[PDB]
Amino acid sequence: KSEQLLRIDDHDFSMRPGFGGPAIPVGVDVQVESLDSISEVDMDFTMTLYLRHYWKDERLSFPSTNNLSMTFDGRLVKKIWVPDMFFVHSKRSFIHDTTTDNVMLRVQPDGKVLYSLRVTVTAMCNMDFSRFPLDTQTCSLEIESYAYTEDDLMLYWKKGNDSLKTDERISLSQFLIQEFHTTTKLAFYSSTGWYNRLYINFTLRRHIFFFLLQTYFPATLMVMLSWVSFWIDRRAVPARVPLGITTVLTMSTIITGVNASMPRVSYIKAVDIYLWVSFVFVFLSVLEYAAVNYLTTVQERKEQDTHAIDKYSRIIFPAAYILFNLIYWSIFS
Amino acid sequence: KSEQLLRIDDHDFSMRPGFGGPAIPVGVDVQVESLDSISEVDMDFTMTLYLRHYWKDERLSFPSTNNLSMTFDGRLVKKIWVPDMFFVHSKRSFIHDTTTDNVMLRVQPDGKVLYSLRVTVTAMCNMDFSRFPLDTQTCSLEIESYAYTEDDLMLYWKKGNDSLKTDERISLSQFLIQEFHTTTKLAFYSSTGWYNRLYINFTLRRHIFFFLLQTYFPATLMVMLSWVSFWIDRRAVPARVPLGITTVLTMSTIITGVNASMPRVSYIKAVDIYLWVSFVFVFLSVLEYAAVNYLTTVQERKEQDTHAIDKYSRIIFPAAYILFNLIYWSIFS
Amino acid sequence: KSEQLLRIDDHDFSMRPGFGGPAIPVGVDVQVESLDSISEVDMDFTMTLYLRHYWKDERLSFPSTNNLSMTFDGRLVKKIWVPDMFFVHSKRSFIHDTTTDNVMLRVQPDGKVLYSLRVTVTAMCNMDFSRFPLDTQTCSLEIESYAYTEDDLMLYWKKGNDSLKTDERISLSQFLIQEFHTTTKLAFYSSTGWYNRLYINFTLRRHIFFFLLQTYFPATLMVMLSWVSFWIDRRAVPARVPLGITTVLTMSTIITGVNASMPRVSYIKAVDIYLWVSFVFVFLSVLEYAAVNYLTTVQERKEQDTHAIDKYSRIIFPAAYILFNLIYWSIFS
Amino acid sequence: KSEQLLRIDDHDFSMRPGFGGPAIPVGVDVQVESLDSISEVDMDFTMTLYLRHYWKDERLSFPSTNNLSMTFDGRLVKKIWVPDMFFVHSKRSFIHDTTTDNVMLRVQPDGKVLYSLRVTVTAMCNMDFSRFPLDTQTCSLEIESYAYTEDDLMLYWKKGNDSLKTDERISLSQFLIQEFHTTTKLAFYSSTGWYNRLYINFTLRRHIFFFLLQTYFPATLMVMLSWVSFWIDRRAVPARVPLGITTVLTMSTIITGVNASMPRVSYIKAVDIYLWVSFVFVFLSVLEYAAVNYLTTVQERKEQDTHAIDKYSRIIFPAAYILFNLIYWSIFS
Amino acid sequence: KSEQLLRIDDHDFSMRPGFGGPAIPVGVDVQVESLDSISEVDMDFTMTLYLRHYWKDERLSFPSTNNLSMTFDGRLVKKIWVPDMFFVHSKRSFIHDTTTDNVMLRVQPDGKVLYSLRVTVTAMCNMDFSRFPLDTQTCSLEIESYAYTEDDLMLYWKKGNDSLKTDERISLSQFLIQEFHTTTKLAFYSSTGWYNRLYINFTLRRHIFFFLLQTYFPATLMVMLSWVSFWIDRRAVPARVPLGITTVLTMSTIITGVNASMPRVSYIKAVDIYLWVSFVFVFLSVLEYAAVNYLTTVQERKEQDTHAIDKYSRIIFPAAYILFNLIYWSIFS
Ligand SMILES: *[C@@H]1O[C@H](CO)[C@@H](O)[C@H](O)[C@H]1NC(C)=O
Ligand SMILES: *[C@@H]1O[C@H](CO)[C@@H](O)[C@H](O)[C@H]1NC(C)=O
Ligand SMILES: *[C@@H]1O[C@H](CO)[C@@H](O)[C@H](O)[C@H]1NC(C)=O
Ligand SMILES: *[C@@H]1O[C@H](CO)[C@@H](O)[C@H](O)[C@H]1NC(C)=O
Ligand SMILES: *[C@@H]1O[C@H](CO)[C@@H](O)[C@H](O)[C@H]1NC(C)=O
Ligand SMILES: CCCCCCCCCCCC
Ligand SMILES: CCCCCCCCCCCC
Ligand SMILES: CCCCCCCCCCCC
Ligand SMILES: CCCCCCCCCCCC
Ligand SMILES: CCCCCCCCCCCC
Ligand SMILES: CCCCP(=O)(O)CCCN
Ligand SMILES: CCCCP(=O)(O)CCCN
Ligand SMILES: CCCCP(=O)(O)CCCN
Ligand SMILES: CCCCP(=O)(O)CCCN
Ligand SMILES: CCCCP(=O)(O)CCCN
Ligand SMILES: CCCCCCCC
Ligand SMILES: CCCCCCCC
Ligand SMILES: CCCCCCCC
Ligand SMILES: CCCCCCCC
Ligand SMILES: CCCCCCCC
Ligand SMILES: CCCCCC
Ligand SMILES: CCCCCC
Ligand SMILES: CCCCCC
Ligand SMILES: CCCCCC
Ligand SMILES: CCCCCC
Ligand SMILES: CCCCCC
Ligand SMILES: CCCCCC
Ligand SMILES: CCCCCC
Ligand SMILES: CCCCCC
Ligand SMILES: CCCCCC
Ligand SMILES: CCCCCC
Ligand SMILES: CCCCCC
Ligand SMILES: CCCCCC
Ligand SMILES: [Cl-]
Ligand SMILES: [Cl-]
């Protein structure tokens, strides 16, 4: 029996290696396999990865006439001491178990141990949509020991920034992913003390041109279309009135359609500001002709060429819209 | 073996400490990690948190030449007595178990015990949407012992209002969160007796300006647009009629779009009252011109300037709308 | 050890108390905590409740110098006999287990037993939507023994109609709940025999005024709007035609919007009958003017005041609509 | 102990009864409790039912002074041999376990056994939507032994067609259910040999009148409405043009609304053919007036009653539409 | 006892057969039962299948007077050595367990073993939607050993390309499936070494004609409809203006409806290019008449047949649209 080469029953494996003395160092490496999904309303993301641990335990040393190591599956884990890592700020997680538990332990003749397992985790990520669709988001995944403070267990990245590897084909449907890197920081709990925490960081961006074409283009086109009435004969009332009211209806249907396709976030975003300013411009173009028609009727009744209001509007409306665009795009980049 | 320092087999751990005498006090602290989601149709919310217990048991005392404590994981829980807390009015819950069970027990030389675990819970919260979107909601999470009355177990907050801590970055996508605090109250069950119950309370609010811009603004603009026809020449029938009917169509499409984007709650809310009053105003503006056209035709036929009805409507319609707004906003704040 | 006061190993607890003789009576009480959700497309509902059992077993009697009882958690259940209740016509269910299993057993010195547990269940409820939105639904939850016929186990409500309690704040978002009560009935299985079955009954109703305002009001308003054309000068063709076609478009958009907001049930309901009759009325109002215009043109061509058709339509259309409303509301209440 | 009346430890229950000789017959009965849901996009359905097995085993015979049988729950199953049935072509399934496992075994003095359990299963059902909404679908549920060929285990329906019972109130929201019956057939696996397979068959149909009223009626009405322009004076251009373009807009909104409410199946169905032919008819009615207006203008310019094209169109359009309807309804029933 | 014919307690089954020498070959066969679902937003698919393993182990040989084999269920798996296969790049998986675990082991007298189980798996599949709806996708499922390198375990397809079988009725609702085949490739891990990997490959295609009819047809029809205005008398302003603005509204509603029915992928696809070019064509047709009306008014005022712009537009617009179509369909096939 291979489990008799390790004196399992001759040691108390409820205590850590080196108990009573200096803390035992534990090194960590991570390989990220995929990014599975992201939820903008609930503000979280899901990832699948391999987690690997390295440490030494003299109680597991065994004699050998060669330098070959022994390999075990998950059934040995319950018989020896292993580190208790957990994911901070997570919502749910599990360890894969088909066709059996995806775990393993490799033991060297001198007592060095490698511990490897495959896991899927869902983690929280606070997002800010004020600048949508030109926003940028930063997310992180955090790893910590549940029960051992830094006086008993010292947790660190085994090879610095070389400890993190990512799959060549990692992708998300609606985002671009960039800038993976690692950091570390100490955390304090008033109940028990100081703990080491490890971080994996990355950044997300959107495809700007899709949103420009889908949203900003039609609204600008409809605003430009409302200016055509300034060049039409003021005596053609049955042509001037329906044009304005139909332009208002078209802009309203565009805004409703755009609202139906964005994530349901109930606060003001940049694209909403652009759309409602455009709507106001279209509304004012109808008030202009109402004033022109009333004044012309008054003059004809009193008495019994282009009106000045049309002449000024032909210049004033586009200049104001251009100024609004300059200010908007200088503010929102 | 560390489990032989505690005389596990020398005591009956199916009975409570102090059995037969006064009740044993148990103190509680809570740390809230995140708020995960909220469901308005099903009226519930989900939270993740750390739960900690404090009590003393002389049967667990052990000799020591120093003042160091001993730490165990979840496997020891089945061998000793622990308190049986549960969440009142919950729908589902679970204890996190990656990479192992997130539990631990720390025992002092004199028998003081700390018991800590990490849990996620979904709890019910009755909501009232009568004043939407200006409504305010209050929710709570409740903790109680399943099997021990106040004569056997005395449950209390360990440090009063200092027993509750919340994460600095706790947030929800569509709500603002404020005013966390704790309370206690006694509950009675006719089957078994009186029990102590603990409460965690907080309040939720919406972003008002988003809803004002998205709903109240377009409806007011369309009502103001329907008043333009009162200043148009009454002889221009092919201009007056299509304008009114198209305004009615536009208002209908706005209301349908607004209904499609709110939570599916099937009873009358304040925003519905505002929208349908505006729709009635638009309808009456079409009836007005129908009457004017009929009377003018009658006069011309009998026989073979501005009509009085237009002159009065130009004043009467805006004043009535202003009065309705004053009453509405004095009632609904 | 408290489990040695009961002679656990001295009895066969695979057989029922009173084996070989008359059936053992088992009394039941229920406390309903909440109604969690309802699904109209799948026709089911979800409930959380406390289930309590009462019976006597002389094998569990123990000596005592007082009248104190002994209390145990769920670990003792596997060592003694307990009744095997299950929920008939259910789709899924589970027993709550945080922070431990929500079970308990209390034993009196003379052998009386109380058995209590907390459970969540989803149950089927056939619904009929023919009279929507004026429909009424009745639902029930059913409890039965899996393996014991009425000759071996007699199941009954412990205190008649006083055995059922409901929470003061029980509510559903889109329904009103009324008339909780209990019944019993015998059921027959050809495979094994006769069994006792217990029932919990209640009734659901909708908020009528919300549906009246959202659906019936706009359709009636549009039908009334289509009658305006009967009072407009027949010589104003460019005013009469667009009005009718735009009214048809508006009614179509209303019907599409209403269809989008009801539960996806694919058979004919009362509100559909009302909407499509209104649509037919609007269609006929356009055919009327087509006939008038053709006849006037014919007369003028042959040759080279109000037409009779308008005069009759002004009376005939509203009277027919009123008659339809009287018949409809006498049929559907 | 009742388990000592059966000599459990005196037999090897890893082998089948009658090992080494002729196959053991196993009879099956089924009672269907409900149909829980159906998914048209994923093509599957869910059912809850009772499964019962009958066979004889002389190793379980016990002495008795009467003819009473002994009843056990699910804990005995692991100690004896039972048949290993599984559901072919299923996606997921489970056995109900509240308040305990819904299993039982009854043993007669001579060794006859009844084995009963309650289960929920989701099974695949390939569907064809070419004739929607006039399509008919056939589904089945299949039962087979996992590890025993027909040489070792003979599986059959215990009472032929009387072995299947269904609940009196079984229903689905959007379908009608008819024609339950059973069949059997032999299946071949190249890896291990021949196996017996049992089938449960049924048929589904839709409510035709709901779909006729919701889809076919409005499209026919709009096609008939487009024919009104053929009777309007050709000199009234501002009446003829807007009518045609608005009819096109109305038909487009109807088609979009209809597409939004059907199951998302991306290939051509019969109702799509009807709708797009109607759209083509409406388009041609606008081209007709364009030609008429151009020819009239040409004649007046050259020079400086009803046109023949209108006279022919008044006859030709309805006859072609009637012919299309005759062919369509002769093809699709 | 059949488990005593195999000397279970006489061997260490924590080590592989042939330990210390050449690697043990393991052959694999696969039978695919169904394709359950596909998710375009999350980019994954789900499959159900049978997995079979073949290898030899002399430690399991048993004496026999015949050539009959012995069959066991899943309970024996924990007592012997079996291969540890897992699915690479998967998100979730499970082994079916109704009415018991769907596993089995067959052992020949000379020690040959067959190991069979039924499993469901969800796997990732990166997709590219640039050419939608004319895109083609390729997916794969991958199988690998968790803990044994190629020096200890040699994994291969048992019968080459004959090792893969698929069900005759495999189908997906929205895709066509073709070209199943197998491959193999070696993979390298810096942590442990080289491993053998097996692949199952297949291809997916859409139904082109459904998308052509639903999207490309209406847009082309509306572009052709906008050209009618070039043949209408330029003096009929109240006919020319509303026609153009209503055509713009119709095209906008078509585009919104089409966007609502495609998978929510936020980057530019081929069908979007076609739709927005068509929208631009419709917009330019309105600018053309604005210019014509202004020039005619200027000429009449100065002074106090067909205009040249209409004559050129009647030719220029269709030729440009035809050229765009030729380029588009030569690029996108
Ligand atoms: C790894 O590189 C990143 C690059 O930004 C840096 O921030 C981080 O500190 C580096 N970590 C180590 C351990 O070198
Ligand atoms: C904590 O403060 C809140 C503030 O409202 C108060 O209501 C509550 O009673 C306080 N509880 C304790 C234990 O002081
Ligand atoms: C309880 O009251 C209801 C009231 O309708 C009645 O139907 C039922 O029979 C009563 N049951 C008992 C046990 O009294
Ligand atoms: C049961 O009746 C159906 C009726 O169609 C028939 O097809 C089937 O063969 C019958 N089966 C038996 C076992 O009689
Ligand atoms: C099986 O056939 C496919 C056909 O494309 C080929 O690519 C593959 O290499 C073949 N594999 C074997 C093992 O013959
Ligand atoms: C509330 C946070 C600042 C946002 C201010 C936006 C103002 C938008 C006005 C648009 C008027 C149509
Ligand atoms: C039913 C609860 C009181 C709500 C009353 C609202 C009345 C709205 C009338 C709107 C008419 C258009
Ligand atoms: C099919 C069950 C009876 C329903 C009959 C409704 C008839 C509705 C006709 C509406 C015509 C527009
Ligand atoms: C592709 C399978 C045959 C379906 C043929 C339908 C043709 C529809 C033409 C409709 C033109 C508007
Ligand atoms: C961004 C990837 C290349 C896509 C270029 C498409 C340009 C579309 C222009 C449409 C104008 C209406
Ligand atoms: C007995 C162990 C208590 C652990 P704790 O103080 O709850 C901190 C957990 C996160 N590192
Ligand atoms: C034997 C224990 C019964 C507990 P109960 O009377 O059901 C009250 C549960 C909530 N504190
Ligand atoms: C051996 C027990 C069989 C029970 P059955 O005859 O299947 C009836 C189950 C519902 N009371
Ligand atoms: C060792 C048992 C193999 C069973 P198999 O040949 O995979 C057929 C399974 C369906 N009846
Ligand atoms: C001790 C075993 C480590 C395995 P690993 O190096 O993590 C590679 C897993 C995939 N074949
Ligand atoms: C209309 C676009 C002008 C603004 C471009 C960016 C200048 C800051
Ligand atoms: C139109 C807004 C007037 C009401 C503002 C609030 C006054 C009570
Ligand atoms: C228009 C409503 C009249 C019908 C009311 C109810 C009379 C039966
Ligand atoms: C317009 C309906 C005529 C077709 C009915 C069915 C004749 C085959
Ligand atoms: C309008 C269709 C012409 C293009 C067909 C394909 C030629 C490359
Ligand atoms: C919004 C412009 C109105 C014109 C009156 C000067
Ligand atoms: C933009 C309209 C200005 C009115 C002319 C004073
Ligand atoms: C929120 C500031 C935006 C200002 C608009 C240009
Ligand atoms: C609603 C106003 C009607 C006008 C008749 C006095
Ligand atoms: C608001 C219309 C009043 C009619 C004039 C008496
Ligand atoms: C529907 C009314 C038509 C008028 C012909 C008498
Ligand atoms: C309702 C129209 C009747 C036609 C006059 C005979
Ligand atoms: C289904 C009967 C309704 C009749 C309409 C009044
Ligand atoms: C579609 C009909 C066109 C008329 C030209 C003869
Ligand atoms: C249907 C239009 C036919 C044109 C007359 C020859
Ligand atoms: C887009 C065409 C405009 C006409 C001016 C030459
Ligand atoms: C397409 C319009 C061209 C204008 C004539 C020069
Ligand atoms: C992305 C290239 C498409 C060009 C349009 C013909
Ligand atoms: Cl006009
Ligand atoms: Cl006109």
Residue numbers in the entry:
A (entry chain A), B (entry chain B), C (entry chain C), D (entry chain D), E (entry chain E): 74 to 377, 451 to 479
Cite, word for word, the article reporting this structure.
The family of ρ-type GABAA receptors includes potential therapeutic targets in several neurological conditions, and features distinctive pharmacology compared to other subtypes. Channels in this family share a common architecture, with each of the five subunits contributing to an extracellular domain (ECD) with 10 strands (β1–β10) and a transmembrane domain (TMD) with 4 helices (M1–M4). The orthosteric ligand-binding site is located at the subunit interface in the ECD, composed of loops A, B and C from the principal subunit and D, E and F from the complementary subunit. We implemented a modified human ρ1 GABAA receptor construct (ρ1-EM) with truncated loops in the N-terminus and intracellular domain and an inserted fluorescent protein to facilitate expression while largely preserving wild-type function.
CGP36742 was the first GABAB receptor antagonist in clinical trials, but is also an orally active antagonist of ρ-type GABAA receptors, and has shown therapeutic potential for the treatment of cognitive deficits. In Xenopus laevis oocytes expressing ρ1-EM, THIP and CGP36742 antagonized GABA activation, consistent with previous studies of wild-type channels. In our cryo-EM structure, CGP36742 adopted an elongated pose, with its aminopropyl tail forming a salt bridge with E217 and cation-π interactions with the aromatic cage on the principal subunit face. The central phosphinic acid group was wedged between loop C on the principal subunit (making polar interactions with S264 and T265) and residue R125 on the complementary subunit, with the butyl tail extending toward the complementary β5 strand. The complex was comparable to the apo and THIP structures, and superimposable with our previous structure with TPMPA (Cα RMSD 0.035 Å), including analogous interactions of the amino and phosphinic acid groups; the additional butyl tail only required an alternative rotamer of M177 in the β5 strand. As in the case of TPMPA, the bulky, electronegative phosphinic acid group appeared to prevent lockdown of loop C over the antagonist, indicating a shared mechanism as well as binding pose among phosphinic acid inhibitors. The CGP36742 pose from our ρ1-EM structure could be placed in this pocket in the GABAB receptor complex by superposition on its equivalent aminopropyl and phosphinic acid moieties, or by computational docking, with similar poses showing no evident clashes and a favorable binding energy score. Among phosphinic acid inhibitors, lockdown is obstructed by a consistent binding pose of CGP36742 and TPMPA, and likely of the subtype-specific agent (S)−4-ACPBPA.
